[PDB]
Structures are given as C-alpha cells and as structure tokens.
Structure 1
Amino acid sequence: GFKQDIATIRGDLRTYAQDIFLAFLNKYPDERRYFKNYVGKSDQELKSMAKFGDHTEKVFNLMMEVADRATDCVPLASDANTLVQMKQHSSLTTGNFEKLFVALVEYMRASGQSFDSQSWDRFGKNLVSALSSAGMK
C-alpha cells in the first residue's frame, strides 16, 4: 500500500527520482522553463549531470518525508506551508504541483511495480488543497 510504496521508492530513490522527474518534464514541456540548466538537454544528458541527480533526489527525499508524515494521505499543514514559502517556489501556482502528481501517478500505473496509485492520486489532490489553504495561488 501507501506505506510500502514509500519504502519502495526510498530503496532506490536516485533511480525513481530521475525517471519520474523526466516523465514530468517531457509530459509538460512548459515546466522545464523553471529549471534553466535543464533546457536543451536530452534525457541521457541530464542523467549524466551531477546536479540533476542530486537535485531530483533532494526533491523526492522531501516528498517522501511529507508523505510519511501524512495521515490517511492528508499532509500536515506545516509541511504544506514549508513548500509554499520555500524561495525556490515563490513563483509557482498549484497548477504546477497538480501536473507533477499526474505524471507521478501515470508513471506508477505504467510501471510493472505494484504501487498504490489511487492513494498517490489522493495524496496529490490533498497536497494541492493544502497548498491552496496555505496561500498558494
């Protein structure tokens, strides 16, 4: 289920983080604009970039922490606030977060693994509602 999924992703965090983030960037090309150093690079080129692996891993590490702290897939208000006031997120709207989770859910469904995709869909929706109440447009 949801808790096992967190253990699965953490077990090979580097791999899952890179593949899911690329799935996100290629599904929503407009989103790459927020990462100027990823522009004009193929998937393999990015997988070779030290900063790419490190950053994506850090993004997913925090996502897993928030997911582990949640109750019944509902994130803590404090975690939502933390994501909203991070300077790196200053110019983001809930729309950007919805797209990430759509790509994440689609990735899980398309993989071979037995992820609890329904819970992740729920988690993403609840997280987006939480960002909204936290003041994100």
Structure 2
Amino acid sequence: GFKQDIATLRGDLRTYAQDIFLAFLNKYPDEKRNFKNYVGKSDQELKSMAKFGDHTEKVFNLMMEVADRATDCVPLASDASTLVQMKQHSGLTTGNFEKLFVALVEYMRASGQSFDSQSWDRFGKNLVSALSSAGMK
C-alpha cells in the first residue's frame, strides 16, 4: 500500500525523483515557466545538471516525509503550511501541485510494480486541499 510505496521510492529515490519530475515536465511543458534553466534540454541532459538532480531529490526527500507523516493519505497541517510559506513556492497555485501528482500517479500506473496508485491520487488531492486551507491560491 501507500506506506510500502514510500519505502520503495526511498530505496531508489534519486532515480524515482528524476524520472517522476521528468514525467511531470514532459506531460506539462508549460510548467517550465517555473523552471527556466531546464528549457531546451533532453531528459539525459537534465540528469547531468547538478541543480536538477540535487533539487529534485530534495523535493522528493521532503515529499516522502510529508507522505510518511500523513494518516490515511491526509498530510499534517504543519507540512501544508511549510509548503505554502516556503519562499521557493512564492509563484505557485494548487494547480501546479495537482499536475505534479497527476504525473506521479500516471508514472506509477505505467510501472510494472504494485504501487498503490489510488492512494497517491488521494494523497495529491488531500495535499492540494491542505495547501488551499493553508492559503495557497
């Protein structure tokens, strides 16, 4: 289920973080408005760029912590607050997060692995709800 999936992702996190983030940027190319230095680069070129690997892994490090601290795929209000208040998220609206979780769920469905994709879907929905409650537009 969801908790096992956190363990699975954490066992190969730099690879999963990069591959899921690439799935997001390729599904929603307009999202590079937020990631100007990733423009004009193939997947293999991005997987060579230091901030790409470093930043995406740190994003997924925190995402797995938020998922692990959740109960029944509902994140802590403290975690939602942190994600809204972060200066690096100043630009953002809940639709940016919705898209990331659409890509993550479609990645998991496309995988051979017994990921609990319905739980990740609910998690993404519940995190968007919590971000809206915590003041994200």
Q: State how many pairs are aligned.
A: 137
User: How many angstroms does 1:49 deviate by?
Assistant: 1.1
Residue matched to 1:67: 67
SS in 2 for 1:84: helix
RMSD: 0.5
CA distance in 1, matches of 2:123, 2:100: 12
TM-score normalised by L of structure 1: 0.99
CA distance in 1, matches of 2:93, 2:51: 25
TM-score normalised by L of structure 2: 0.99
The answer for unaligned runs of 5 or more in structure 1 is none
CA distance in 2, matches of 1:126, 1:85: 18
Residue matched to 1:95: 95
User: How many angstroms does 1:115 deviate by?
Assistant: 0.2
Runs of 4+ off more than 6 Å: none
The answer for unaligned runs of 5 or more in structure 2 is none
CA distance in 2, matches of 1:50, 1:96: 23
CA distance in 1, matches of 2:66, 2:122: 14
CA distance in 2, matches of 1:16, 1:59: 11
User: How many angstroms does 1:40 deviate by?
Assistant: 1.0
CA distance in 2, matches of 1:99, 1:81: 20
Residue matched to 1:11: 11
User: How many angstroms does 1:37 deviate by?
Assistant: 1.1
User: How many angstroms does 1:54 deviate by?
Assistant: 0.7
- The range that moved more, 42-51 or 21-30, is 42-51
User: How many angstroms does 1:2 deviate by?
Assistant: 0.6
Aligned-residue sequence identity (percent) comes to 96
Residue matched to 1:135: 135
Residue matched to 2:77: 77
CA distance in 2, matches of 1:111, 1:57: 20
Q: Deviations over 1:69-89 (max 9, x none)?
A: 001100000000000010010
CA distance in 2, matches of 1:133, 1:51: 31
